[PDB]
Amino acid sequence: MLTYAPLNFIAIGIGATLGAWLRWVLGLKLNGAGWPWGTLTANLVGGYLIGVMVALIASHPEWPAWIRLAAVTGFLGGLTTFSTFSAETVDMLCRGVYATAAAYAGASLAGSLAMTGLGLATVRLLLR
Amino acid sequence: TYAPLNFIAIGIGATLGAWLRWVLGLKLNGAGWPWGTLTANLVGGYLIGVMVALIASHPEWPAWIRLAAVTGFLGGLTTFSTFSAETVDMLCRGVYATAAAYAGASLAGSLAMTGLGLATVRLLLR
Amino acid sequence: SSVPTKLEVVAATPTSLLISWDAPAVTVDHYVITYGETGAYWSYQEFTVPGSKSTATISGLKPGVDYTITVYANPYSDAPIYYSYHSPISINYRT
Ligand SMILES: [F-]
Ligand SMILES: [F-]
Ligand code: NA
């Protein structure tokens, strides 16, 4: 295939859809006032999985390009989210509780990076 | 409420937002700075401050308007997974100054954009 | 088996370097050069050269310092470099 193929938009839409449904439920089952566990799980889980996907694709050039568009650009692109995080963090700031605001940005920022590192490490651990 | 029309607003929302984020990454993600994803994050950060402030003063809108434009579009437009992958890759190659500058720009800029997205709506009603 | 190969400094001055490598017979989309004082990662910089190019110039360097120069190849036309399956080649030049 080539870039901008109709089958690519399909793999992105489908992946993004299933990704938002998972993010939506998570944001309703575990998300509660004072601390958003749902938004943090979607990003942390997604951050770890993209580390896994990036490691897999790097060591499997043969795989078709739609595994990347569906799994990363699609699924993990609808699972994680910067918008809702930014809003929740700005609510904490306007609601005075600066301590939990910093605790949230650092938890989901450094948490995502670390989780991505583990995802990369997980794959690097088993393939070798 | 887990209604079937609810799943239809998320999928249709994420599908559009994702596509826009994808194309932004293709055409914008530069040679030393991910302008594609940063754009989708800042823009998405500014548009959520407008939607949240807008949904606050219009509690008469249906439940699918928020799930379609906030949980759908903006949920798929912005990403955290693609951000940490890029940032972790910068650290991998040793460009710590870029990773730090990229994390800061994404975190601070997103908060400020979401702030300016609220200030514009409140100024618009007054 | 890395991509590219035979990376080396061809021309060197007290503040600039001219590096060369063997571009594979099959053109890549672009390369990514990262350089800096060996170990001092807050000094590492990076730029990208097109796939057609096989040489690059690195200027603005400090004398007597040991640098590490790494060239990453990206075969993709629409994916960032961390999806690449090419092991980079790296060298070290002093001064
Ligand atoms: F993430
Ligand atoms: F970003
Ligand atoms: Na997203």
Numbering used by the authors:
A (entry chain B): 1 to 128
B (entry chain A): 3 to 128
C (entry chain C): 3 to 97
Show the paper's wording.
Moreover, the channel dimer contains two F− permeation pathways, with each subunit contributing residues to both pathways (Last et al., 2016, Last et al., 2017, Stockbridge et al., 2015).
In meso crystals of the Fluc homolog Bpe in complex with monobody S8 diffracted to 2.8 Å Bragg spacing, and the structure was solved using molecular replacement with the Bpe channel and L2 monobody (Stockbridge et al., 2015) as search models. One end of the channel has a monobody bound in a familiar way, with its diversified loop occluding the aqueous vestibule, while the other end is free of monobody. The only polar monobody/channel interactions within H-bonding distance are between D80 (S8) and T3 (channel) at the periphery, the carbonyl oxygen of Y43 (S8) and the backbone amide of Y98 (channel) at the opposite periphery, and a salt bridge between E48 (S8) and R95 (channel). For these reasons, the Bpe-S8 structure, taken together with the electrophysiological results, provides strong support for a cork-in-bottle mechanism of monobody block and its logical accompaniment: that the crystal structures of Fluc channels represent the functional, F–-conducting conformation of the protein.
